[PDB]
């Protein structure tokens, strides 16, 4: 679990409800992360380069009860319900795979192990077609679009996925991070 | 932040291998080429073998030519080598070396070379 | 393929300029440019930790004292002073060809 968190962030979301996971200053292109837990409506975004991957709610977020996790992938897509006891600032972490020569996606950065569960489902991915000019995709309806920003469960918060980088093996920054996304979200 | 964990030492009589364990933190072995080095007085810096992305295989040094033996318990984020051919004289500070497989230009990763985390060593016989 | 060397004595006054340098028996030029060449430095009681990771990309934690520019195989790693604690071997290195190699090792001597 990698304590990856922001500071100082504007609430700008209602009236209109737009957000940024991730807010970008022009300061040394500094990516601020902020994905908040939200009361239990609906999101929609852009979904630049497929960063978001999916979502997790329930009543706690955290153990002696149930939330589902929904995560895609250039092949499927799984739902889960588990009493997951998942990390405050979950990632799906993206790193590469020395052996297979390849990259891998990763849910242990996410979770670490779930207890006791039984329901699992697996289908198409419905979140990565992104047919490539936004085209904004409505929670599940996907439609083309230019830039003009237009149109028991208690909580929730995105996932994102991110594509660490490979600059140096010694300690200058973790290299976790990498892009920056949004979402709107509301009733 | 790669944090590369070495062994204690450990002195055995010639022809008996000494397997060496390396340990990582920060990054899996997965994430990583693992490179092993030997040094000692009258001999200097000398590499032994590692991991080369382009063929994502180890290769071993021109001398070591057999009876030198490199492998990865990639679940425990560990990794290991051991030298049969042990002559007593090939006592010696043993080391692993770590970089990135790959490094990252936008999407585009290339291969990466280098030997830039080291960890303490161990002197084994 | 071998890495040459310039005398190892690398004598020292502190607060003073030094240089050491390596050149190679063999070509470095790699597919892509990269040129992977990198110096290590080596103190008492522990393994050498590389200063400069490639040619001129100096890693944190080493001052901009050090550089390790050069062409034409000919890299010279140039402190520009020499400072207290900056003594131990040091090393040139090769990962340009398959087989790796390292110099001789200088060291810096007082």
């Known amino acids: 679990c990698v304590n990856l968190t922001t500071r100082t962030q504007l609430p700008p979301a209602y009236n209109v409800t737009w957000f940024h996971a991730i807010h970008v200053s022009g300061t040394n292109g500094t990516k601020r992360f902020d994905n908040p837990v939200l009361p239990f409506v609906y999101f929609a975004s852009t979904e630049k380069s497929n960063i978001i991957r999916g979502w997790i709610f329930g009543t706690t977020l955290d153990s002696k009860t149930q939330s589902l996790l929904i995560v895609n992938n250039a092949t499927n897509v799984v739902i889960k319900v588990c009493e997951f006891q998942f990390c405050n600032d979950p990632f799906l972490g993206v790193y590469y795979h020395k052996n297979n020569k390849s990259w891998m996606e990763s849910e242990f950065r996410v979770y670490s192990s779930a207890n006791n569960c039984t329901f699992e489902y697996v289908s198409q991915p419905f979140l990565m077609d992104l047919e490539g000019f936004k085209n904004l995709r409505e929670f599940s309806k996907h439609t083309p679009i230019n830039l003009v920003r237009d149109l028991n469960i208690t909580r929730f918060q995105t996932l994102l996925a991110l594509h660490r980088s490979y600059l140096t093996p010694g300690d200058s920054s973790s290299g976790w991070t990498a892009g920056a996304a949004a979402y709107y979200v509301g009733y | 932040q790669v944090q590369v964990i070495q062994s204690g030492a450990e002195v055995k009589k010639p022809g008996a291998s000494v397997k060496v364990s390396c340990k990582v933190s920060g990054y899996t072995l997965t994430e990583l080429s693992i490179h092993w080095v030997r040094q000692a007085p009258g001999k200097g810096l000398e590499w032994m073998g590692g991991f080369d992305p382009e063929d994502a295989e180890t290769i071993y040094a021109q001398q070591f030519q057999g009876r030198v033996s490199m492998t990865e318990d990639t679940s425990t984020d560990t990794a290991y080598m051991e030298l049969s051919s042990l002559r007593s004289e090939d006592t010696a500070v043993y080391y692993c070396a770590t970089a990135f497989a790959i490094t990252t230009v936008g999407t585009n990763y290339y291969y990466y070379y280098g030997m830039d985390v080291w960890g303490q060593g161990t002197t084994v016989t | 393929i071998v890495l040459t060397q310039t005398p190892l004595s690398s004598p020292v006054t502190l607060g003073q300029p030094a240089s050491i340098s390596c050149r190679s028996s063999?070509?470095?030029?790699?597919?892509?440019?990269?040129?992977?060449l990198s110096w290590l430095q080596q103190r008492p009681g522990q393994p050498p930790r590389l200063l400069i990771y490639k040619i001129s990309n100096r890693f944190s934690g080493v001052p901009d004292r050090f550089s390790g520019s050069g062409a034409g195989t000919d890299f010279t790693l140039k402190i520009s002073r020499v400072e207290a604690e900056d003594v131990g071997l040091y090393y040139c290195?090769?990962?340009?060809?398959?087989?790796?190699?390292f110099g001789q090792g200088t060291r810096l001597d007082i």
């Open positions: 290195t090769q990962a340009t060809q398959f087989p790796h190699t």
């Open positions: 063999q070509s470095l030029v790699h597919s892509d440019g990269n040129t992977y």
